[PDB]
């Protein structure tokens, strides 16, 4: 999920901004890059 500062959730925006920067960021980017990799192969089928 998301944890803003101390004992508070963030809302709808700072997800992109990310000035709070809790750890686990390595876990998010792994899922991201893995997803977009399949997208790159999927969009390759499109042009094909």
């Amino acid at each position: 999920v998301r944890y803003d500062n101390s004992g508070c959730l963030v809302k709808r925006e700072d997800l992109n901004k990310a000035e709070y920067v809790d750890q686990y960021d390595a876990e998010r980017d792994f899922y991201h890059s893995l997803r977009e990799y399949i997208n790159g192969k999927a969009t390759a089928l499109a042009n094909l």
Partner: protein, 215 residues
């Protein structure tokens, strides 16, 4: 000499830029136009028609705004004055203290000229409800935090502190520390036992954060 003097007025002008943008990130209230001016407006304001600049008239005053007085409940406007002569000692520091006396506030800050001697060290850090700060004109030209390697240092309140200790369930101190009189430390004016969150970027996973307290 026209040449070397214009070098110094450009120095002091950029030095005025440094102390300006510095007072902003402390939470105090200014605007983007305050820290940003060309040489034109600077020559009009603080420089005479004779072509020789001034000293004491550069002194100004600024306050905090909104969240600054919310996050940190104890704080207020301060009063900044400049120096006169390269030789330190009591002199105008007497009335400077007197200025702090009746006008209260928190911390009078003054930019030096050339040299520092133990005379002016008579009593620097006692105004028991508060304190003051010392800055050299030489050392201040461009800001260090904005330079290259130095990342963003985020100061937090006592609230976030005790919660951070409720995360990993830790006793106080014992964290990676940060010395004071450190050029970065004194820059933000940190007191004893103040945690500052640091967001650093090196390439492994890229961006990640760590905490460092202040001894």
């Amino acid at each position: 000499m026209d040449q070397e003097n214009e070098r110094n007025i450009s120095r002091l002008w950029r030095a005025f830029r440094t102390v300006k943008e510095m007072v902003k990130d402390r939470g105090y209230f200014i605007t983007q136009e305050e820290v940003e001016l060309p040489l034109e407006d600077f020559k009009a304001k603080y420089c005479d028609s004779m072509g020789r600049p001034q000293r004491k008239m550069m002194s100004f005053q600024a306050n905090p705004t909104e969240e600054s007085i919310s996050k940190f409940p104890d704080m207020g406007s301060l009063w900044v004055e400049f120096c006169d002569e390269p030789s330190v000692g009591v002199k105008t520091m007497k009335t400077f203290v007197i200025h702090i006396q009746e006008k209260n506030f928190q911390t009078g800050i003054f930019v030096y000229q050339n040299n520092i001697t133990p005379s002016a060290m008579k009593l620097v850090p006692s105004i028991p409800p508060a304190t003051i700060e010392t800055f050299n004109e030489a050392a201040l030209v461009v800001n260090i935090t904005h330079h290259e390697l130095v990342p963003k240092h985020i100061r937090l309140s006592s609230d976030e502190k005790r919660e951070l200790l409720k995360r990993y369930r830790l006793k106080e101190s014992q964290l990676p520390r940060i010395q004071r009189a450190d050029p970065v430390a004194l820059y933000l004016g940190l007191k004893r036992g103040e945690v500052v969150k640091i967001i650093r970027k090196s390439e492994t996973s890229g961006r990640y954060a760590s905490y460092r307290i202040c001894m």
